[PDB]
Design a protein around this ligand. Structure first.
Ligand SMILES: *[C@@H](NCCCCN)c1c(COP(=O)(O)O)cnc(C)c1O
Ligand SMILES: *[C@@H](NCCCCN)c1c(COP(=O)(O)O)cnc(C)c1O
Ligand SMILES: [Mg+2]
Lengths: 376, 363
C-alpha cells in the first residue's frame, strides 16, 4: 500500500493544491501523502524540547519503512512492540543496539524473536512476566513499568518486589519506565511520574539492591488536531525540571510516536457520489472509518478537514466513507461548498493511528501512501 | 457450554495450528442457509459476502444453490475466482465509481442498485447492459423516499434505463420482523403507483438482509421471525419475484474464535488476562458492530477478571468485567457466534498476526 517519489523531475496553498492534484492524477485516490521533511522537523523539535533524552520512535502509530529510514539517518532510536516491528527495523538496517522492546506481555516466541535480532531490553510489570526471563537471564536487561482503564504498569510497592525478585533470580534490571497515555495535554502527569520513579530508585539503593541506570518516560507528547495544544518546548519545560532531580548516573529515554508522525501525513479522498437527504448533501468518499479514518473509532480522533474547492455558498453536508455501513461516517455535520463527483477532501494531521489501524472491510482498496522528500 | 467433542476439536486445532484461530464449520453454513430457505419459501437468497467474504463459505453456498450479493470489485473477484456464474449475482452498492460498474459488468453482473438521480445518470452509458433496483429507506445513509423512488423510476423511463424493481435494507440484527412487514407494504404501494402512472411494471422486490442470530441473548426462531414477512409478501402480485440479501444469519453462527492467554496480572481486584486476539483483530466487531459475544473457557471458583487484547492500547479490552476460573498462560478463551463482522473488520495494528481461519467439514 505504498511507494516513494525519489525523483519528482487551514487553507491549502497553490503549490500544495498542485501537488495534491498531480498526485491524484498520477496515482489515483485515496492517498496518504507522507512528507519526510515533517518527520525530521518533528524529531528535531522534540530533541530540542527534551535535551539529554534518547528518543526511541514508537513504530506503532506509523510503522512505515521510509519513516524508519528517515529517523535512523537523523540519529533516532526505536521502540518496538512485536516481532513484526522487529522484522521491519531489521530489514531497514537498524542496528539492534538502537532498539528497545516495550510490550509488557510477551509469549516466549516474542522474546526469542527479538533476541535473535539482538534487541535485549524488555519491559515487565509483573512477576508472571519476570519468570519468563529466567531462561534468558544472561541475555537481557529489563525496564520495570509503573502505573500511578490503565492496562499496564505496576505500583511502586510491586516494582520493589519485582526488583528484589530479579536480584534473587539473577536477572538484570536496566531501570524503570512509564507511559502516561497518548495525546497527554497536561505535562504534570510526567512530572508526578518522574518524582515517583525517582523515589523508587532511592528505595532500591536504600534496600542495598543494584542501583538503576535508566528512566524511560514513555510517549504521549501531544500535537495539534482541531484544538491548540501546548507548544512542545513549554510542554517539556516542567519535565526537564523534574528530570534534573535525578542522580547524574541515570540516563533518560522516551518513546515518542504520535508527535513525530502525526503532522507528517495529509490524506486525500475523492467523492464517489452524492445525494440530498433531509436537507443535507451527503458525499460518499473513497476513504472512511474502515480505512484512514479508522482513528475516529479507535483513537477518539477528530481531524481538520478541507476541500480544494473554495468560495461560494457553504452547504450543510455529511462526509460518508465508502463502505455499506451506516456507521461509516467521517463528519456528521460539516459546511462545504458544493462538490462534484471526483472532487477532493483533504485531512490534516493524518499520520498517527490512521492507516496503521485500517481494515479491508468490503474489500475496498486501502489508501496508498506516497512518500516524499526522503532524501535531502 | 461446549460439548466434550467441541473441546477435543478446539484443543486438537490449537495443537496443530497454534492460536489465535477462527474455526469455520461449513455444516453450520449449510444449516443456516437451509433454515432460512425453509423459513422464506420462494425467496431467492443472495448471500452478502461483506460479513464473511471467505472462499470456502462461497464454495459451500454455491454447492447449496445459493445466489450472491456483491458490493465491490474485490467481492466480484472473489466469486469469479470461485467459479460462481454471474447470473447468480447482484451488485448492491448504491454509490459507485464508473470503474466499479465496469468491473462488475466485465464479470457479467448486470443488476445494480441506485437511490438517487446522480447515480442513475451514471447508467446512461450502460443502458443496454443493466437493470436497476431502486433502494428505498423509510435507515440513515442510503435509500430514497417512496416519492423520490417514483421520480427515479419515471426519469429512468425517460432515459431508457431498465428498472428491475425495488430494494430496502431495514438494518443489521433486526430483532423485530415488523420492520420488514412495514417496508414490504410500502414497496407494494409504490409498485401500484408505477403501474398507475403508465410506467413499466416492477418485476422484483429485494427485502435486503438483517435477519438476526443469537448472541448473549436468544432471538426469535427464524420460522417464527419470517412468518409475518411471508404473510406481507403474500399480498404482492403473483408475478413479483422476491429476493433477500442475508449475511449475518448464514455466517455468524458458523465460526468459533479461539485465543490463548499470553500473560496475566492482578490490577485492582481483577485478574487481567492478555490474549493473542482482541479489538484490533477478531473482536473488532466490539467497536464497529456494537457487538457482544458469548465467551467461555475449556475448564467453578469464578473470579473477577478482565479479558484484554494483545495490542499496547488501553482501548483493546474484550470484556471489562467477566467471571472466569483461574487460567494459566496458554489456556484458551473461546468466543461463539464469531462469524460475521469479526475477521472481516480486523486490522494489522502493531503487526499482530490475524487469527488463522480453519475450515471444518468442507466436504
Ligand atoms: C502507544 N500506545 C497506544 C496508543 C494508542 C492510540 N490510539 C505507546 C507509545 C507511543 O505513544 P504516543 O502517544 O507518543 O504515540 C509509547 N510507548 C508505549 C508503551 C505505548 O503504548
Ligand atoms: C450489510 N450492511 C452493513 C452491516 C454492518 C454490520 N456492522 C448489508 C447486508 C447484510 O446484512 P446482514 O445483517 O444480513 O449481515 C445486506 N444488504 C445490504 C445492502 C447491506 O448493506
Ligand atoms: Mg543496549
Amino acid at each position: 500500500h505504498s511507494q516513494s517519489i525519489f525523483d519528482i523531475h487551514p487553507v491549502l496553498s497553490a503549490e500544495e493544491i498542485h501537488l495534491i492534484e498531480a498526485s491524484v492524477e498520477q496515482f489515483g485516490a485515496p492517498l496518504l501523502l507522507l512528507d519526510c521533511d515533517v518527520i525530521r522537523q518533528q524529531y528535531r523539535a522534540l530533541k530540542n524540547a527534551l535535551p539529554n533524552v534518547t528518543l526511541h520512535y514508537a513504530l506503532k502509530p506509523l510503522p512505515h519503512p521510509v519513516v524508519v529510514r528517515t529517523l535512523l539517518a537523523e540519529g533516532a532510536s526505536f521502540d518496538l512492540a512485536t516481532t513484526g516491528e522487529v522484522e521491519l527495523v531489521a530489514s531497514e538496517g537498524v542496528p539492534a543496539d538502537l532498539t528497545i522492546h516495550t510490550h509488557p506481555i510477551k509469549r516466549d516466541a516474542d522474546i526469542r524473536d527479538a533476541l535473535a535480532y539482538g534487541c535485549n531490553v524488555f519491559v515487565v510489570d509483573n512477576l508472571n512476566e519476570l519468570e519468563k526471563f529466567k531462561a534468558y537471564r544472561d541475555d537481557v536487561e529489563l525496564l520495570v513499568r509503573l502505573s500511578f482503564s490503565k492496562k499496564f504498569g505496576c505500583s511502586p510497592e510491586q516494582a520493589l518486589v519485582i526488583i528484589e525478585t530479579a536480584k534473587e533470580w539473577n536477572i538484570r534490571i536496566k531501570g524503570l519506565s512509564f507511559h502516561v497515555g497518548s495525546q497527554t495535554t497536561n505535562p504534570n502527569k510526567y512530572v508526578e511520574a518522574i518524582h515517583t520513579c525517582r523515589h523508587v530508585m532511592e528505595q532500591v539503593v536504600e534496600r542495598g539492591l543494584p542501583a538503576l541506570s535508566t528512566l524511560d518516560i514513555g510517549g504521549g507528547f501531544p500535537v495539534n488536531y482541531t484544538q491548540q495544544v501546548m507548544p512542545i518546548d513549554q510542554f517539556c519545560a516542567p519535565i526537564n525540571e523534574a528530570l534534573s532531580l535525578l542522580p547524574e548516573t541515570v540516563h533518560v529515554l522516551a518513546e515518542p510516536g504520535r508527535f513525530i508522525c502525526a503532522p507528517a501525513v495529509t490524506s486525500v479522498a475523492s467523492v464517489m457520489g452524492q445525494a440530498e437527504r433531509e436537507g443535507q448533501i451527503w458525499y460518499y468518499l473513497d476513504d472512511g472509518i474502515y480505512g484512514s479514518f479508522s482513528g475516529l473509532m479507535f483513537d477518539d480522533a477528530r481531524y481538520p478537514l478541507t476541500t480544494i474547492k473554495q468560495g461560494g455558498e457553504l452547504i450543510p453536508s455529511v462526509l460518508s466513507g465508502p463502505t455499506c455501513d451506516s456507521v461509516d461516517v467521517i463528519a456528521e455535520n460539516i459546511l462545504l461548498p458544493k462538490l462534484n463527483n471526483g472532487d477532493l477532501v483533504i485531512g490534516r494531521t493524518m499520520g498517527a493511528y490512521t492507516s496503521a489501524t485500517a481494515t479491508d472491510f468490503n474489500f475496498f482498496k486501502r489508501a496508498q501512501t506516497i512518500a516524499l522528500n526522503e532524501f535531502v
